[model samples]
Target: GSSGSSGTGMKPYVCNECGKAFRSKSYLIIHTRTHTGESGPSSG
Candidate 1:
């Protein structure tokens, strides 16, 4: 299990667009979607 907490000096996966870090690359990708206006998980 990952801590997934930022500012704790644990996240290594960082977003090149926002400089936000995550515990995994997948998390960074999802976060970037918000910036790019990409569709996220379906409501269904």
Candidate 2:
């Protein structure tokens, strides 16, 4: 169901290795970065 957001604002995807709640589709992408120990660039 990666087609698009379901408007529910609840992205139910948990990592097999670790337990995590991805509230949105893009959250998984960000979560991967967390595991890699790489913080996102400054938004400011």
Candidate 3:
């Protein structure tokens, strides 16, 4: 147990809208909008 080259990775982002997975936060945020049931701008 003397390895110093190991890397720590974040748990993949999980969508609260559905059980979907995205490798990054931006992707998840984009995909979330689609399932939000408001397929348009929420504001002007």
Clashing pairs in 2: none
By lDDT, the best candidate is 1
Q: Estimate each model's TM-score.
A: 0.50, 0.40, 0.49
Please, what are the lDDT tens digits per residue for candidate 2 over residues 1-44?
A: 47864554344565544667666647766786677654655455
> In angstroms, how far off is 34's CA in candidate 2?
1.2
lDDT, residue 31, model 1 = 88
Looking at model 2, how many pairs of residues clash? 0
Root-mean-square deviation of candidate 1: 8.9
Candidate 3: Cα lDDT at 43: 68
Q: How many backbone overlaps does candidate 3 show?
A: 0
> Which ten residues in a row are the worst by lDDT in model 3?
3-12
Better of 1 and 2 by TM-score: 1
TM-score of 3: 0.49
Better of 2 and 3 by lDDT: 3
Off by over 4 Å in 3: 1-12, 37-44
